[PDB]
Each structure stands twice: as C-alpha cells, then as structure tokens.
C-alpha cells in the first residue's frame with residue numbers, strides 16, 4: 001500500500017484499497033455540540049499513567065509515534081464508556097500546514113491546529129493485532145491542540161524531532177511522561193468509530209476531550225519540519241496528515257458533562 005495525504009494518494013483515494021473507508025462507523029467526525037447529549041450513565045474516566053514506560057519515537061512516514069512498553073498494565077485507560085482495561089501502546093499527532101487546520105475531529109466544524117491520539121488496546125484480546133479485529137478493541141483518547149502558550153511537557157518531543165526527520169528513522173525516547181500532555185479537565189465526548197488511517201478498521205471507542213491544550217507556534221512549526229519522505233529523497237514536508245470528517249450515519253455522540 002502507498003496511501004498518504006497527497007492529491008494522488010490521499011483520503012479521497014483510500015477507499016479503493018480499503019473499501020471500509022465508506023463504512024458505517026468511520027472516523028473522524030464533526031462533533032455537533034448542540035446535538036451531543038449528556039449521558040449521566042457514563043462512569044468516571046480513569047487515566048492511569050503513573051507507571052508509563054516510553055521506549056522509542058518513530059517517524060513512520062505518516063506521523064511520528066511515541067511507543068510505550070505495553071507488555072504489562074503500566075499505563076491504562078479505564079472507566080468512562082469503557083468496560084475493562086485498555087493498555088497504552090503509543091501516541092501520535094495529526095497536524096496542519098497552517099494553524100487553521102490539522103485536527104481530524106472538528107467541533108461545530110472548527111478545525112484545531114493539531115490533534116493528539118493516545119492509542120490503547122483492550123487487554124481482553126491479548127494483543128493489539130487481535131484487538132483491532134474487534135468492535136471494542138481500541139480506545140483512543142483524542143486531545144485538540146490550539147496555538148498559544150507553549151506546552152512544557154511537549155518540549156522533549158519537539159526537541160527529538162530533528163533526529164527523526166525522515167521516514168524509517170527512530171530514536172530512543174525513554175522516561176517521557178504522557179501526563180504532561182493532558183489538559184486540566186477530563187470532560188469528553190464519546191462515540192463508536194474507526195482507525196483514521198488505513199486499514200480504517202471499525203474497532204475504536206473514541207473519547208475526545210473538550211478542553212484543548214495550548215502549544216506554541218514554535219512547537220508546532222517544528223512538527224512541520226518533519227518529512228514524509230525517506231532519507232535522501234526529495235523533501236515532502238510532513239504536514240496536513242489528517243483525514244477530514246466522515247458521515248456520522250446511525251451514531252450518537254454522548255457527552256460526559258452538562
């Protein structure tokens with residue numbers, strides 16, 4: 001597969017190799033804040049990242065992933081809409097060429113400068129590969145980024161990006177604390193959806209925080225210096241690696257808050 005974000009291989013093309021692209025529970029979606037309903041039954045959300053073990057950061061040609069040790073329950077997401085225990089495997093971002101675009105989800109059609117995805121898999125399936133074949137296999141915690149003040153807990157990530165400029169480059173990335181990426185509030189929206197990149201599998205419980213985090217223009221400018229290409233190839237800046245909103249179809253977006 002040669003999918004990506006260009007005119008020729010971007011989201012509009014994905015359906016030809018991955019027909020579920022046109023499925024019934026695709027992500028991202030627009031979150032209409034006036035249609036989403038408070039659900040008083042949602043249990044409280046539990047983000048337990050005290051024992052998180054980061055390992056490595058990888059430019060995969062599409063984004064950069066901060067990978068964790070997910071061989072035990074070290075950093076887990078529980079509660080909210082979720083039954084059972086979901087293990088953090090990695091986080092990454094999607095971002096734009098300009099501060100007015102970059103997020104995958106939108107809020108009343110507003111696009112943020114970027115969106116953070118903390119990916120977790122349901123430990124009842126044993127491994128990530130099995131979990132992505134299940135409707136309840138993953139939980140993604142999505143956090144919007146707006147441009148304003150710097151986010152101090154992001155700066156270790158932006159500082160290593162020079163070392164992973166091109167596709168296939170990785171760097172050791174131990175002792176990174178992903179708590180430093182969260183906003184104050186854990187108020188959220190939730191809905192059933194999909195992976196936002198091929199293979200586009202309909203395996204995700206989406207949990208999208210209401211409160212964006214602020215990052216500085218300088219921080220996001222450094223995301224934009226990354227490259228989709230490999231070393232020694234013609235430079236194609238890694239920007240606008242987001243999929244646009246997809247049809248909601250027969251789904252409800254629930255709010256955790258009034």
Ligand SMILES: O=C1NC(=O)[C@@H](c2ccccc2)S1
Nearest residue numbers: 117119140194195196197198
């Ligand atoms: O949150 C998401 N963003 C992505 O790129 C999708 C994905 C695809 C493959 C592995 C992990 C995550 S799901």
Ligand SMILES: [Zn+2]
Nearest residue numbers: 093094117196
């Ligand atoms: Zn993502």
